[PDB]
Amino acid sequence: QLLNYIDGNFVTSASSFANINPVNGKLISDVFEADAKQVNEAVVAAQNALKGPWGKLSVQDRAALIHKIADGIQARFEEFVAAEVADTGRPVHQARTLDIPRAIANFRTFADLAKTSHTDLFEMSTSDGSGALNYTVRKPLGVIGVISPWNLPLLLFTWKVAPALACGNTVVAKPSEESPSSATLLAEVMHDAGVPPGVFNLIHGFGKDSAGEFLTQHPGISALTFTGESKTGSTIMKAVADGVKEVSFELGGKNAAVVFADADLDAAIEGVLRSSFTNSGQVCLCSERVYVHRSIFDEFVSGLKVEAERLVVGYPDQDGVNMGPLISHGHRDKVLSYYRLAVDEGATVVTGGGVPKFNDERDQGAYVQPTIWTGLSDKARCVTEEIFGPVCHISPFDDEDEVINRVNDSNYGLACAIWTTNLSRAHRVSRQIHVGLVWVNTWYLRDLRTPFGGVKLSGLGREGGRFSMDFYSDIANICIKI
Amino acid sequence: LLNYIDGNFVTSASSFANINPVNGKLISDVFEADAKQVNEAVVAAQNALKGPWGKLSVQDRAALIHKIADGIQARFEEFVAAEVADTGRPVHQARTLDIPRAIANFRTFADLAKTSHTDLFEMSTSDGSGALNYTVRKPLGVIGVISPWNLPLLLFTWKVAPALACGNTVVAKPSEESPSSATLLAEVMHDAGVPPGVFNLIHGFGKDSAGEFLTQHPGISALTFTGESKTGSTIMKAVADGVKEVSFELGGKNAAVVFADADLDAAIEGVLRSSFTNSGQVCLCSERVYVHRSIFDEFVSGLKVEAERLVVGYPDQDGVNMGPLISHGHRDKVLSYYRLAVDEGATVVTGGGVPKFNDERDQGAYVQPTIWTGLSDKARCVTEEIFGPVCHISPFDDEDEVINRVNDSNYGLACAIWTTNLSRAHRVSRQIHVGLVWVNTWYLRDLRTPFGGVKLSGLGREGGRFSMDFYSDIANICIKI
Amino acid sequence: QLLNYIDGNFVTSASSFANINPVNGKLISDVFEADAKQVNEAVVAAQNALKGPWGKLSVQDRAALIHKIADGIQARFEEFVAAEVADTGRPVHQARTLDIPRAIANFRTFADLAKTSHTDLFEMSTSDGSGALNYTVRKPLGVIGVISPWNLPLLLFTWKVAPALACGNTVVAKPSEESPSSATLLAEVMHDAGVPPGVFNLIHGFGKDSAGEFLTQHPGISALTFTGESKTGSTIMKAVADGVKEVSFELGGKNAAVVFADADLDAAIEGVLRSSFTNSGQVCLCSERVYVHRSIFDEFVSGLKVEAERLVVGYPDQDGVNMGPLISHGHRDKVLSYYRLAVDEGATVVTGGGVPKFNDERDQGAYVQPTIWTGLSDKARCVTEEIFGPVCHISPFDDEDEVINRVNDSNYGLACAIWTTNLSRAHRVSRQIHVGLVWVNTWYLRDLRTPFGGVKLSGLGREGGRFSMDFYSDIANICIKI
Amino acid sequence: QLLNYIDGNFVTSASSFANINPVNGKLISDVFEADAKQVNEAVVAAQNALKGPWGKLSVQDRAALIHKIADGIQARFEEFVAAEVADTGRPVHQARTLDIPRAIANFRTFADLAKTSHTDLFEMSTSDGSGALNYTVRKPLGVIGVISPWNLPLLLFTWKVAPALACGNTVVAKPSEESPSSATLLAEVMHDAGVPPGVFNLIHGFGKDSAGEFLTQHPGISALTFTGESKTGSTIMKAVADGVKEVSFELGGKNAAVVFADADLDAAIEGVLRSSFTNSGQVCLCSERVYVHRSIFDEFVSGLKVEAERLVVGYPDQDGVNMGPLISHGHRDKVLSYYRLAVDEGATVVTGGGVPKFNDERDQGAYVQPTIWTGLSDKARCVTEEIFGPVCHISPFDDEDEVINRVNDSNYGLACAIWTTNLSRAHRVSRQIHVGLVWVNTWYLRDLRTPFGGVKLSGLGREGGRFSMDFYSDIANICIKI
Ligand code: NA
Ligand code: NA
Ligand code: NA
């Protein structure tokens, strides 16, 4: 059983929902859904905590307490690994090396920035010759509403909660209904670490007519930060508009990888394998479109096919497992529906295209095969809409400007990876991709000080580094006439 | 007054009247852009990004922007006249605040465009060869600009200057009530050699007009707006499906606070200005005033005196201090607050009506500078934004009390504090829940500072680097070595 | 006994010298003086250490190790308190709440800054229209020679060593002969924490024709950072000139305090008492000149007399001890010589002027009385020369511009404290004072992110925050034509 | 015809010295050498101008006035060209497109940074719980002493004078005896722009026992910034040592170009031709050492020989002129003394090696030939000592780690140019070169915002961008207790 955490107490709710293990379809736990009344209690508790001990902590004391939260996750490391794996079916090795360490690192990085961050001093002259001073300060924005996704549950959850707390805000967070275990554990770490009641609040539930909608509509929040589907971003923006709430969105992507004729071909095959199928292609940053220079296109597709078919699709702790299932049955229905749509649009299915057959309990889970399509036009729905499964379409190109234009011809703009060994090409091309993040000869390498976010439908605002310290703060200007 | 689109001055199939509010006389007809014309503006701005404007170095861009500035300086007095006519502002203030600030907007952001740089982050990797992350600023794209009538050219250019400085193209809809200086600006840009499609001026209104069409148009990348909060919320919903970047500077109900240890004459002068400047039609004006009990009556009587000394009349009159409100429709809204004040229990210390001229001005849109006392913190006249030359004055006793009373608001743009005490100034300033605090002064602006509000008073910050960030895509480029 | 620490090993020397407890003149330990050959050994080992594991550490791992050093000092907190107190006589109170906590915070602040710090990206246009990028990086400068003072032994020692290590340098450091203990213990902490051999080297000795000089002359160093007497600063600057070594100097001052008529009078009396007599007036930052507006002058002098006479002078762990002895008998000779000079120049001795009579072992120590002078002119030697003991002279003033000129009419310019409750005056007056550091209504309040340094004879350069990160690094610009 | 400019007046002197045209050895003008007394008068007047209307300008007005200076140079553009060409023999085209535009840009860039630069606000907590603010401000350092070189007279002179004035200092500036004309014209432009008297002072003369040394010894300056030979940098550091004056040094170098096998070969030949022979190899950034991968070595050398022999050495207005003379006969004697040393050391002379025969007035000037050597060892003097003439030695190399070691095996480290088309190599190699400036696939591309300086004997400190705004300012911390 997974309880809510409100004003320093773990509390049940009236109704509950099932958390299902996508590996086998079995029940992991029951999760009490916070109702509107409990959400209001969380918000009000969070407002009030801003006037309690939390509000009086020095930036050094606040940061030391956040490092302690992080020590707590570390001390329960394997429990956190086990929770993420149960909920989502992610390979244990990924949970051990990507997800939980990044969740620890999020807290440490922003606790550090809390200590080092400063503001600005501007001098000016005036008519009377005595001058003025303008200095700025950072204050907590207020209560931050976090609605976070199921694909990187603890990582993306802490990505928001860490800078929010580092900036002195209080929090009411709603983790995905598909993945609530690690967040529920984080609350326990919060509690045991002595985080004052009301600072961090955890409400479980869904979106519409549930905890997520209640949060989004509550007038006592000062901001809503959200990662997830683009149409949901749009819904959230409409919902907080009457309140003119500060908003921060990381949304969909139809991300491209580009492979030039001078790429290290083996490294690019391996890189596109990772960018297409990591977390079974359920990363916002995954490459679902791939452009490859004509002269190496056949060799690239053949190489990637071989490598994709070597992927081990199986149990999270199975020997050399690469790929787990999708998050849920309902998500798999959506993915398989694009699988059929691609055949109908005229794709050649280079590999995959269906669901593997296990002849064991995994057949009741939510697996699909890693899939490569070829032969679709740039207009096809499967080349333009985010699928959020382990798939990519590969298309040839001849000319640099042509491929830049094809990558950019999109209502999204989150990320792009480019493969080339040429110094000029790397820099010339990357600056021309209309996205928030480019990688050259790698993918999803993250320095947490960098600005991160997207253009067009992929989001608005930036987080990371000082961008987060600014978003989760009131920036106030104080002008002294001397 | 014509629209300016893709390098050409063009008419529309419908015009509206621009009325001089000093005397009710028609100044000019203004062609209203239709949906088809707004689309034409946006499409041309989009195309302008791939033309000569797009290929200018940052140094040549800034030079051209400095040339726009020079262009305005060269026609300074036509600009003063245009702004006066539209709005009735004192000729002196147009001449030393409005027009100079608009020129400084262009110059400051041109200068920032040349000095701004971005970031390099080094990192280690597993294989031990490392990686580099660097950031770049790029044009965001087409900037939709919808701007207010109270400081027409100043607030128009406050947005347009950073948009252009960051290499964007612009589709700008100035207020229906003050379309003249913008139209001149378009002439300056045309004569200065700004490439076609880079700057586009479209005239009209909000709902079912140019403004609405702009905000609904999918070709823009951002919408920056200064105005009413409710209009802000409307825009946010309209751009939500395209998840457009937004920047809002919205209403306030701003307070001025006078502590017992203030320089009382300076404070009286200060609040006089903060209350009645531009006939109280700055979003930054003080419509609430808290004065320490020990000095409350002396402050009110002094403010009464100085307020009654203000000269209300012609923009060019000898010692004029105030002009009219922007329009009859706005005077109607303001006179309706004047009545609501009485009906709410207010003591009228001064004004509370219109003045009498017995000449054309009676056809104008004047109201008197007004002071109220005796209302409660929950009176509507003390909570809601009026945007006229009026303030209510209320006593206070304690520091924590007045802080709480200032912050007890759904708005939070600005606040002025009067005190001679060092500790008090810094202690109290930091606790006011607004974007902008002034101590011992008001509306003193350094264009590098973050400017914006909290709560209903806005979203985001503009000014200095905050503008340079808002009006650009920040992109991260990560090179594995 | 106290050894040098060279290339991973404690070692003795030919010569040794005594370390004397200034409370009672008794021997604490023998200290081995490093010779030229062993200084050469230290520099060469530091050079090679740059090419060993130390140099392969990530910024993250380097920072973690520097936090381990800080941990290792926290774990021996009281031993470090004991060692500082023994060498110098400072009250145990001050060692526990200022000295040792700073040494520790020095390492932690600079380790944090190493993790958060980044550099710059400048794009530019070029003729051919393809453009160029300039990006800068921070690299280790090389071997940093550190020569440090006895007045704040571990605090000022670590103030240099911490940023030097945080920036990836290696270090050869010479603590003061008068206070070698806390540094030798620090060497132990480094050894125990696994600091690779050669990264940190400790050499004992004196200046001329001893370790200090040898260090400054050695061609193998990249920089010389020094805190102390101005003339010594000049001497070091000449000695490194042939090698054009980077230099950073925090030198002396004759710091003033200004009390304006609208000051909080009791607060100003307390603050000037603290800025004149803290550490027995042996801080670079103490106020030896004081200017008080005429209207409150007599009342200020009377009040300070009373408070200075309530000061407890005695043992480091005595009840509410306020002052210990001076660092040494030799230093007391110099200070008393000044006490006589002040009388000779026609000063009224308001209080003090001598040494107290203990009638116990403290009579064998190096104590003097807190002293206050009036009636000297601005040109008197005792008003213009740094005495570095617990004394201040007080003079009246009438005008603001007048007292600004009087404070500024000095060949030094480290620090100044001003007392006033007036908003305008604090900002108007502070910006006109020709020094590196001004305090308003307080003194020696340190934020370790701020630039610290002086003007004129009081120094060269700035340290603290980014200024330390720039000083202890090569800043390199890399320009890529695209 | 060349007078000093002191406290607002052009004044002559007791002695005069001749300014000779290096194209033909003919007298251009006589220059009045400043004596110790005039040097004192210049400093004293600079100190007073700080207290005058100059000191009171807002930053906006001071910047407005620096732009006027720029405008005034621009209105007399061709006279500045004539003056530069006359003193130095520089090709008119280069004077007209590099030297004078850069001189004007220096002023515009720093006037602009004066208006945009701001400082820092640090908040901090305190024991009593009400906290404190620290903020910084930039103020004029004071009187800046400028001593500038003959190789880029107006460019390097204004590179120091622009930021000095932009930060509100006053200046006493001693231009090179070899090239005093353009600085004297600047003085006229200053006068005519209405720069208040004493703000800018021009003194002419030599170094030791002349205006150079006297400026350097005056206690009245706050800083001395100098570009030129390293030994003269050392001498300077010693002379201001008793003063602890701020110092900023851009000294010599023995800069390398490195060409890897994957370079665009024709681009690298053109690039090394420029880096070797521009301004007749009298730029401190010139490459006198070149390392070329053995596989392209013969082809590179053979290609560079051809391009070198296509260089037109002659008159500044000669139809296709590429190179003018060296700066003086005195300089030519040194360079020819190296051309012989090279032969005596065993060099093969690929081309040049002597002086060309014009059979006209040019034979009385100071020309040498563009020269290329091979065959020397890395320890040869001609490969290790700065010649400062139009020459380079070319050596082959095999390994990347090897060429990096050979490049870095130098007491200097000013700049390096690398040629490669490989992305990783470019970034991997550049960061390992121990210099202040690396160019990749170009040379002497300058963005004035970037830090500019050297390591080891090549310099001290950084200039450019905020590094200039920081060096030419007092940085002051003001700490307000609340
Ligand atoms: Na913010
Ligand atoms: Na942006
Ligand atoms: Na400085």
Quick one: CA dihedral C61, C64, C70, C73, positive or negative? negative
Q: Are B148 and B126 in contact (CB under 8 A)?
A: no
Beta-carbon count within 10 A of C303 CB: 18
Kindly list the residues from chain D whose CB atom is less than 8 angstroms away from the CB atom of residue B427. Answer: 130, 482
Mutate which of D115, D135, D260, D478 to disrupt the A interface (most A C-beta within 10 Å)? D135
| Class of residue A318 by CB neighbours under 10 A (exposed 0-12, middle 13-18, buried 19+) | middle
Helix or strand run (H / E) with residue C166 = helix C153-166
Task: Judge whether B66 is closer than 8 Å to chain D, CB to CB.
Answer: no
Method: X-ray
Task: Judge whether B481 is closer than 8 Å to chain D, CB to CB.
Answer: yes
| Class of residue B444 by CB neighbours under 10 A (exposed 0-12, middle 13-18, buried 19+) | middle
- Ligand closest to A144 (CA) is 1
Q: Strand pairing partners for B29?
A: B17
Q: Using CA atoms of A290, A293, A297, A301 in order, give the dihedral in degrees to the nearest 10.
A: -30
Residue type, C198: G
Tokens of B467: 């503008």
Mention every residue, 6+ apart, whose C-beta is less than 8 A from residue A457. Answer: A230, A251, A252, A411, A412, A413, B242, B243
> What structural domains does chain A harbor?
1-252+448-482 (3.40.605.10), 253-447 (3.40.309.10)
Q: Strand pairing partners for B254?
A: B286
Residue for token pair 């600091």: C195
Q: Using CA atoms of B41, B45, B48, B53 in order, give the dihedral in degrees to the nearest 10.
A: 120
Among the partner-chain residues A132, A439, A476, the one whose CB lies closest to the CB of B435 is A476
Residue C131: CA count within 13 A, CB half-sphere: 17
Q: Strand pairing partners for D415?
A: D437
- Cα of B221 from ligand 2 centre, angstroms: 10
State how beta strands D473-481 and D132-140 pair. Answer: antiparallel
Strand positions, DSSP E, A82-228: 119-124, 132-140, 143-147, 170-174, 200-202, 223-227
CB pairs under 8 A between B and D: 32
The C-alpha atoms of residue A402 and residue A405 are separated, in whole angstroms, by 5
Residue A420 annotated as lining a ligand binding site: no
The C-alpha atoms of residue B355 and residue B312 are separated, in whole angstroms, by 8
Q: Are D16 and D31 in contact (CB under 8 A)?
A: yes
Tokens of A5: 């955490």
Query: Of C63, C117, C59, C61, which Cα lies nearest the Cα of C449?
Result: C117
Strand positions, DSSP E, B397-470: 414-418, 436-439, 458-459
- Chains near D with 3+ CB pairs less than 8 A apart are A, B, C
| Class of residue C8 by CB neighbours under 10 A (exposed 0-12, middle 13-18, buried 19+) | middle
Residue type, C288: E
State the greatest distance between any 2 C-alpha atoms of chain C, in Å, as a whole number: 87
Kindly list the residues from chain B whose CB atom is less than 8 angstroms away from the CB atom of residue C59. Answer: 122, 124
Mention every residue, 6+ apart, whose C-beta is less than 8 A from residue A405. Answer: none
Task: Judge whether A474 is closer than 8 Å to chain B, CB to CB.
Answer: yes
The C-alpha atoms of residue C123 and residue B167 are separated, in whole angstroms, by 14
The C-alpha atoms of residue B480 and residue B133 are separated, in whole angstroms, by 9
Q: Are A441 and D423 in contact (CB under 8 A)?
A: yes
**Out of B177, B245, B249, B344, which one is annotated catalytic?**
B249
Find the radius of gyration of the CA atoms of chain D.
23
The C-alpha atoms of residue D448 and residue D450 are separated, in whole angstroms, by 6
Tokens of C233: 């600063």
Strand positions, DSSP E, C36-141: 119-124, 132-140
Q: Using CA atoms of D271, D272, D277, D282 in order, give the dihedral in degrees to the nearest 10.
A: 100
Nearest residue in D to C229, CA atom: D244
The C-alpha atoms of residue D331 and residue D308 are separated, in whole angstroms, by 21
Tokens of D214: 């006297």
Residue type, C275: S
Mention every residue, 6+ apart, whose C-beta is less than 8 A from residue B414. Answer: B252, B254, B284, B434, B435, B436, B437, B438, B453
Q: Are D3 and D11 in contact (CB under 8 A)?
A: yes
Mention every residue, 6+ apart, whose C-beta is less than 8 A from residue C163. Answer: C110, C113, C463, C468, C469, C471, C472
* Resolution for this experimental structure (Å): 2.2
CB pairs under 8 A between A and B: 169
The C-alpha atoms of residue A477 and residue A138 are separated, in whole angstroms, by 9
Q: Strand pairing partners for D371?
A: D391
Residue D232 annotated as lining a ligand binding site: yes
Q: Is D250 a catalytic residue?
A: yes
* Eight-class DSSP state of B313: S
State how beta strands B169-173 and B142-146 pair. Answer: parallel
Mention every residue, 6+ apart, whose C-beta is less than 8 A from residue B313. Answer: B320, B322, B323, B357, B361
Among the partner-chain residues D139, D141, D244, the one whose CB lies closest to the CB of C233 is D244
Q: Are C171 and C144 in contact (CB under 8 A)?
A: yes
Residue type, C14: A
Q: Strand pairing partners for C20?
A: C27
How far apart, in Å, do the first and last CA atoms of chain B sit? Answer: 58
Residue for token pair 């109900």: B253
How far apart, in Å, do the first and last CA atoms of chain A sit? Answer: 61
Residue type, C23: V
State the greatest distance between any 2 C-alpha atoms of chain A, in Å, as a whole number: 86
Query: Of A372, A383, A394, which Cα lies nearest the Cα of A306?
Result: A372
Rounded to 10 deg, the angle between the B152-165 and B180-192 helix axes is: 30
Per-residue b or e along C163-175, where b marks 16 or more CB atoms closer than 10 Å to that residue's CB: bbbbbbbbbbbbb
Task: Judge whether C430 is closer than 8 Å to chain D, CB to CB.
Answer: yes
Residue A226: CA count within 13 A, CB half-sphere: 30
Q: Are B136 and B118 in contact (CB under 8 A)?
A: yes
Mention every residue, 6+ apart, whose C-beta is less than 8 A from residue A396. Answer: A291, A292, A293, A294, A297
- Cα of A461 from ligand 2 centre, angstroms: 7
The C-alpha atoms of residue B448 and residue B470 are separated, in whole angstroms, by 14
Cα C209 to chain centroid, rounded: 23
- Ligand closest to D463 (CA) is 3
- A213 phi, psi to nearest 5 deg: -70, -45
Residue B450 to residue A230, Cβ atoms within 8 A: no
Helix or strand run (H / E) with residue B291 = strand B286-292
How far apart, in Å, do the first and last CA atoms of chain D sit? Answer: 61
| Class of residue D412 by CB neighbours under 10 A (exposed 0-12, middle 13-18, buried 19+) | buried
The C-alpha atoms of residue D13 and residue C477 are separated, in whole angstroms, by 44
Among the partner-chain residues D123, D125, D136, the one whose CB lies closest to the CB of A137 is D123
Kindly list the residues from chain D whose CB atom is less than 8 angstroms away from the CB atom of residue A426. Answer: 423
Query: Of A39, A46, A62, which Cα lies nearest the Cα of A194?
Result: A62
State how beta strands A371-374 and A391-397 pair. Answer: parallel
Query: Of C100, C326, D411, C221, which Cα lies nearest the Cα of C212?
Result: C221
Tokens of A367: 């697996």
Mention every residue, 6+ apart, whose C-beta is less than 8 A from residue B96. Answer: none
Tokens of A148: 């976070």
State how beta strands B286-292 and B254-258 pair. Answer: parallel
Distance from CA of A400 to the nearest CA of D (A): 17
Query: Of D261, D347, D341, D325, which Cα lies nearest the Cα of D299?
Result: D261
The C-alpha atoms of residue A198 and residue A191 are separated, in whole angstroms, by 10
- B239 phi, psi to nearest 5 deg: -95, 0
Residue type, B189: M
Q: Are A138 and A117 in contact (CB under 8 A)?
A: yes
Query: Of A346, A383, A419, which Cα lies nearest the Cα of A254?
Result: A383
Helix or strand run (H / E) with residue C466 = helix C465-471
Beta-carbon count within 10 A of A333 CB: 11
Residue for token pair 């404190």: D132
Residue D122 to residue C450, Cβ atoms within 8 A: yes
The C-alpha atoms of residue D70 and residue D102 are separated, in whole angstroms, by 11
| Class of residue A357 by CB neighbours under 10 A (exposed 0-12, middle 13-18, buried 19+) | exposed
Residue type, D8: G
Residue A242: helix, strand or coil by DSSP? helix
Residue A459 to residue B243, Cβ atoms within 8 A: yes
Strand positions, DSSP E, D148-260: 170-174, 200-202, 223-227, 246-250, 255-259
Find the radius of gyration of the CA atoms of chain B.
23
Q: Where are the alpha helices (DSSP H) in A228-328?
A: 230-240, 265-277, 294-309
The C-alpha atoms of residue C390 and residue C24 are separated, in whole angstroms, by 19
Helix or strand run (H / E) with residue A9 = strand A9-11
Q: Which B residues 9-48 touch A at CB under 8 Å?
A: none
- B203 phi, psi to nearest 5 deg: -95, 155
Helix or strand run (H / E) with residue A438 = strand A437-440
Residue A195: helix, strand or coil by DSSP? coil
